[PDB]
Paper text:
The AAV2L336C variant is of particular biological interest, as it is defective in genome packaging and is associated with reduced infectivity. The [name] viral capsid is formed by an icosahedral (T = 1)6 arrangement of 60 viral protein (VP) monomers, and has a molecular weight of ~3.9 MDa and an outer shell diameter of ~250 Å.
The final map of AAV2L336C had a global resolution of 1.86 Å, with a largely homogeneous local resolution distribution within the core of the capsid shell that drops to ≥1.92 Å at the solvent-exposed surfaces. Notably, map resolution increased by 15 shells (0.09 Å) after correcting for the curvature of the Ewald sphere, which has been predicted, but not previously demonstrated with experimental single-particle cryo-EM data (discussed further below). In addition, the AAV2WT structure is ordered from residue 217 to 735, with the additional N-terminal residues compared to AAV2L336C (residues 226 to 735) occupying the base of the interior opening of the fivefold channel. The AAV2L336C variant displays a 2–3-fold defect in genome packaging compared to AAV2WT and lacks PLA2 activity resulting in a defect in infectivity. An altered location of the PLA2 domain due to the N-terminal disorder would abrogate its externalization via the 5-fold pore and thus its function.
Residue numbers in the entry:
A (entry chain B), B (entry chain J): 226 to 735
C (entry chain I): 226 to 429
D (entry chain I): 614 to 735
Write the structure that this text describes.
């Protein structure tokens, strides 16, 4: 098998191809293992599941397919895009045997030993893609990556299982046994999905009217009027124009919301206390609380409030080399969803206000903030943006009902997503006893596998057709001089992605 | 071009044709102008946009097409209707030059000078139809009307623009140049849309059951029972019949709600204070509050509460000659959406009640009102009625998502609505200098244009098929004598619409 | 004639269309005039030439054709571009007569009176396009512009002419006489020229 | 806002005739398009005069002009990995939008815009 990475832009399609080198260890020393949360974990953190000897291939991030330059080409020139089909290949398989004896490691090729590969194309296994896990094909084509281990969760009561808990043995599926010189290929067609909106609106939902012309409709503009030395209740009505534009009758409503706490990138603005959980937005499922992250698509901040972001309401990526645990804000890249504030409520403020009572002579009108607003007829909204380093698709859970199944971390909801591609080194027993033993074999030859993997995805484009007169916004590299070029290697060969790149640069009217 | 107004009723279709005479001044003295809110405006009222020299034709009100008698014919005989296609014409164009000299105005026809016309049929301009603006074809065919000026809004930060703000020059579109003796025509096909519900339900969602037959299901009918000289907790259950009808198990839920303050048409019932804004129902978008008007479809009042209406929850039309600002209630016509109270919550009361706690021996059950209820599975609702003097369609905003896009002021949500029809007088420079000057011309011949416009719309009807035995409600003129006939001219030639007329007279079961 | 401004991007071509309104005075009160530098001008500034009653159309600036947004589209996405062909039109001609009498100006349309138009397609006149003069179609389509006056220079010795100096009378060319309701059109094909380099080198 | 073409002077020799103000050197450029109002004499004397007429009706002309140009493009095919430079409008708020009209209707071009944003190797 040959090496193919490039992008092919033709008409309204762009074909991306990526090739990487991978290495697959033996996981679990070939065993399936029951796993669960520690005895001391909080109820919110309990789980029960299985670890398996299998690995899996994950290309569920945009930078597995688009170079930074390709991404720029995409986002500056198109109002929409969406996956069409893909071709996946494993080739140049090599199985290597390791011998550690007497202090010295000696790796030797074993042309005969196999790896096993199958796609779960009937979606019979727990689908763990679409959880934003590490282990995807790396963004830089020269980086070699380890194939991540497949494990899954089932129902739990505390750290224990329940009757409904399921156990899957992956060897109960047919799989291809691949030797050196064997290749694995399959093709996949995406179901029809809406184009992702790679634009920002240039109008706000509350300013769709002609500012020059009054409405023929009236609104209640005054509830009382001067009487002698005092007021008297009098209802009075006006036709809204430009000057009272907030009062105009309108056809639509902003998108739903589920309110997030606001935190500041300026450390001093924040309360000195531990609220990351107690202040967090959450959902409550079967007695357990889970963080709602990133949650419903809501604008990250209002005008001129760049420093603020919702506590759990934005994707946050690590800078190159950032550690796992409690890194400072300078170690992460916080995405900003401000482009959708034309339609979607700001994540950190109320949806609006509703009346709570019935006013009368002795009772004044009362209102209350609305901090969670489910969908209402007439609402419109934008989904969360996608990012070069962000996820692509998610499997829509198989359920009686769902609403607007755009996966909340962003990307394309798929009923039949790209199937899980499972792989494992076939165990090779070491020297057996010459007396029969019924015990299952526990001594195996140490080995691992390596090879190349390629994934080709055809994307459909919706070309920008802007009729605006003035230039628009475009993603651009900096002109100024610098020690390192953005999206390159440094002097040590480390590739890095210095910033998140969304898709929403071009604009469109509502 | 000839004059065509009439209505043609054939089978399940009614074709409406309207012809009017229009006059188009020169707007902005041919200039595009940046416009914005005043420096002193509240944040809620800020805007940024452009005024253009162009005018536009707007027939987006039912009375542009239906005579009062036609409307009666429609609403008394049909359970539903919806637009199918339309034909639009401009003809008998006349361009007139005005000369004001020496005190005396002299208007002269200029057969050569042109008007420019284009439809935005690709929807590349900000769409300002569907904001309930004035300037539509007038209801009475003998009234001559001024073509309104086209302007639009884009993003703003206070009174300033932002990078994403867009500027549209309409001359960057192809347009037909029309002279005297030229006509402009185009045809348009409505996309499939649901029939408007021109009926009222004769059943309420909470009374769908057979009153004669008990349910086989049980509900919790008592939580405690007499014990010796005192009570003891005991759960007890009953099958609901007619006598406990409120308790029956049911399959459906009333429509969503977003609660409105209640105001009375009787002045004395109202609080003496200014609550028209502070008490108002609103949404909150990018740091700005906007009145929610008319908002989600909700019944205006409950049984026998005719005098009450939601503060911003009903369309309100002016009586003939009513002024723009702070008119008394006697100057306006307040619509009433009581017909939908069979399914949709009353706009001024709570959706219902939910439990807020977990009762036990030492803790009593607690409930709270629900003043905003987003959509739930099993909900059903009616959309707001349409009115003879009300809007017809609105453009569904171009967004990732929307829910039930029936425009909240009423009418038909269209992805591809009737296109904006833009027109302007071609500037004709006045006498130029005989020495070359690079400056753009600022001296033009004064002129205006006039002509006729006709719009033909074919409507599809869903004929009433009532199997009820007793007569039903029908819209009827008064029998009694009066000084003026409703929906006529007075002695001064002024046409007036004395009342709003909805569509919901006939009834149907749920 | 109808109004056409838009840009059409297809494959490896972009078609730009611009329409403007223009006004043409009477230049030189219909006369040809000899012109020259002032007597006091420096030798470096001397010239000799002719002013003519004719005007001319000049679209020799990019913003006559590309909107700013179009230009952005061009320069962000292409390594090169070059003109291929063009179509030019004059239409909706109106000839207006002005009467200034007794203090009052009255402008009246004259449907019969003509304008004369010709293209110098054999390049027999002094070619004054390409000198970066003002008077081109303005960048913003709603601006109305004055047609600039045609004049040219020939050889001079100081402010005087020489034997080799040439004089061109433009009425010695055939020209179309255009009335109200007449249109003028012609098409033109650019010769092959190198693509303009719409890139910067990333190497020195 | 700059020039497009220039006529290459008709000469025995020239070298690299790219016009120095920029744009395309053309041997046969777009032709000059000349226009003038036909003179209309005012009321003549009723006695014959050989003198050329010097009294004319004041007049001017107006109309529309359209120009359509087809341009050929050489599409960017950059194989560089990192993003490149692109012409972009400013994001920040401002009183006027660049390349628009102001409150008085005056259009303005706030900056020159060249063509050289994308890059290529030598």
């Amino acid at each position: 098998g040959n090496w193919h990475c490039d992008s092919t832009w033709m008409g309204d399609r762009v074909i991306t191809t990526s090739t990487r080198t991978w290495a697959l260890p033996t996981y679990n020393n070939h065993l399936y293992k029951q796993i669960s949360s520690q005895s001391g974990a909080s109820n919110d953190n309990h789980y029960f599941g299985y670890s398996t000897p299998w690995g899996y291939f994950d290309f569920n991030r945009f930078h597995c397919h688009f170079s930074p330059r390709d991404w720029q080409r995409l986002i500056n020139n198109n109002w929409g895009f969406r996956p069409k089909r893909l071709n996946f290949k494993l080739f140049n398989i090599q199985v290597k045997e390791v011998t550690q004896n007497d202090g010295t490691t000696t790796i030797a090729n074993n042309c005969t030993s196999t790896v096993q590969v199958f796609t779960d194309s009937e979606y019979q296994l727990p689908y763990v893609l679409g959880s934003a896990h590490q282990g995807c094909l790396p963004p830089f084509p020269a980086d070699v990556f380890m194939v991540p281990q497949y494990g899954y969760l089932t129902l739990n009561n505390g750290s224990q299982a329940v009757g409904r808990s399921s156990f899957y043995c992956l060897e109960y599926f047919p799989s291809q046994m691949l030797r050196t010189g064997n290749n694995f290929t399959f093709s996949y067609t995406f179901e029809d999905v809406p184009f992702h909106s790679s634009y920002a609106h240039s109008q706000s939902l509350d300013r769709l009217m002609n500012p020059l012309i009054d409405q023929y409709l009236y609104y209640l503009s005054r509830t009382n009027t001067p009487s002698g030395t005092t007021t008297q209740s009098r209802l009075q009505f006006s036709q809204a124009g430009a000057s009272d534009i907030r009062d105009q009758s309108r056809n639509w409503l902003p998108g739903p919301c589920y309110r997030q706490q606001r935190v500041s990138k300026t450390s001093a603005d924040n309360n000195n206390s531990e609220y990351s959980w107690t202040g967090a937005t959450k959902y409550h499922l079967n007695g357990r609380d889970s963080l709602v992250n990133p949650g419903p698509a809501m604008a990250s901040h209002k005008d001129d409030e760049e420093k603020f972001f919702p506590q759990s309401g934005v994707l946050i990526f690590g800078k190159q080399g950032s550690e796992k645990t409690n890194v400072d804000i300078e170690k992460v890249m916080i995405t900003d969803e401000e482009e959708i504030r034309t339609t979607n409520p700001v994540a950190t403020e109320q949806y609006g206000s509703v009346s709570t009572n019935l006013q009368r002579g002795n009772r004044q009108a009362a209102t209350a903030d609305v901090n969670t607003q489910g969908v209402l007829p007439g609402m419109v909204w934008q989904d969360r943006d996608v990012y070069l380093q962000g996820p692509i698709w998610a499997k829509i859970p198989h359920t009686d009902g769902h609403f607007h199944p755009s996966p909340l971390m962003g990307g394309f909801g798929l009923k039949h997503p790209p199937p899980q591609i499972l792989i494992k080194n076939t165990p090779v027993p070491a020297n057996p006893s010459t007396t029969f033993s019924a015990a299952k074999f526990a001594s195996f030859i140490t080995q691992y596998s390596t090879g190349q993997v390629s994934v080709e995805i055809e994307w459909e484009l919706q070309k920008e057709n802007s009729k605006r007169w003035n230039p628009e916004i475009q993603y651009t590299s900096n002109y100024n001089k610098s020690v390192n070029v953005d999206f390159t290697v440094d002097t040590n060969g480390v590739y890095s992605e210095p910033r998140p790149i969304g898709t929403r640069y071009l604009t469109r009217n509502l």
